[PDB]
UniProtKB/Swiss-Prot annotation:
This is GTPase KRas. SUPFAM superfamilies: P-loop containing nucleoside triphosphate hydrolases. Changing Q60R: In a colorectal cancer sample; somatic mutation; promotes interaction with SHOC2 and PP1C. It comes from Homo sapiens. The modification N-acetylthreonine is found at T1. Glycans are attached at T34. Its main location: membrane. GO terms for cellular component: cytoplasm; cytoplasmic side of plasma membrane; cytosol; endoplasmic reticulum membrane; focal adhesion; Golgi membrane; membrane; mitochondrial outer membrane. Alternates between an inactive form bound to GDP and an active form bound to GTP. Activated by a guanine nucleotide-exchange factor (GEF) and inactivated by a GTPase-activating protein (GAP). Interaction with SOS1 promotes exchange of bound GDP to GTP. Ras proteins bind GDP/GTP and possess intrinsic GTPase activity. Plays an important role in the regulation of cell proliferation. Plays a role in promoting oncogenic events by inducing transcriptional silencing of tumor suppressor genes (TSGs) in colorectal cancer (CRC) cells in a ZNF304-dependent manner. Belongs to the small GTPase superfamily. Ras family. Changing Y39A: Decreased interaction with MAPKAP1/SIN1.
Length: 166
């Protein structure tokens, strides 16, 4: 079985860093903000293997029929913010609504990902993230692409969410 995962979130939250840690097991500090490529990876989850197709999104702050098309094939979404960036946590709501639009559906598999948990200076409290995730009916996973903490879990959890949805 194959699963199409899409990684979304505001500029600079760690979309590309998270994805490259999962795929290539290293942390990148300066990854081109315009590159929007897909990656492949077979993984074993709860005894069952899947081929993961992960679409790293980028682009400009704008509507794009082209991007809508690449994202409509997504079966699950990683909603990423950075714990030291309040604006990125506020954008989460807008990302979820855009997903609902492109998929014409309220119950798309999704996980909320609070990235950069290695950093000391957090502006977004765990409790606000937990309540937001609670209201959406989705899991919330803290991660650090730098240390690799939570990275497998973020993606593995999204796959479980997709599996349950069928
Ligand atoms: C630095 C490059 C980068 O990482 N960026 C730019 C920003 N790009 C987007 O968010 C692209 O637009 C979307 C991405 C993913 C989805 Br799902 C939907 C959309 C989209 O069409 N819109 C229009 C309104 C948007 C918005 C987002 C946040 C706050 C307010 C409005 C997203 C990430
Ligand atoms: N401390 C820390 N820095 C990160 C983490 N993830 C990404 N970064 C850095 O934050 C910046 C944004 O990363 P990037 O993945 O390019 O953001 P994107 O625009 O969402 O793809 C880069 O300089 C990364 O090296 C993390 O988990 N912890
Ligand atoms: Ca990127
Ligand atoms: Ca344009
Ligand atoms: Ca409808």
């Amino acid at each position: 079985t194959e699963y199409k995962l899409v990684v979304v979130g505001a500029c600079g939250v760690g979309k590309s860093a998270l994805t490259i840690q999962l795929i290539q097991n290293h942390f990148v500090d300066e990854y081109d903000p315009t590159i929007e490529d897909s990656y492949r990876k077979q993984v074993v989850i709860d005894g069952e293997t899947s081929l993961l197709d992960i679409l790293d999104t980028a682009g400009q702050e704008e509507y794009s029929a082209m991007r809508d098309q690449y994202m409509r094939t997504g079966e699950g979404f990683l909603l990423v913010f950075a714990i030291n960036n309040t604006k990125s946590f506020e954008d989460i709501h807008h990302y979820r609504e855009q997903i609902k639009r492109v998929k014409d559906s309220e119950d798309v598999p999704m996980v909320l990902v609070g990235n950069k948990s290695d950093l000391p200076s957090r502006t977004v409290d765990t409790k606000q993230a937990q309540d937001l995730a609670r209201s959406y009916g989705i899991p919330f996973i803290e991660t650090s692409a730098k240390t690799r903490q939570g990275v497998d879990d973020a993606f593995y959890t999204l796959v479980r969410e997709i599996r349950k949805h069928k």
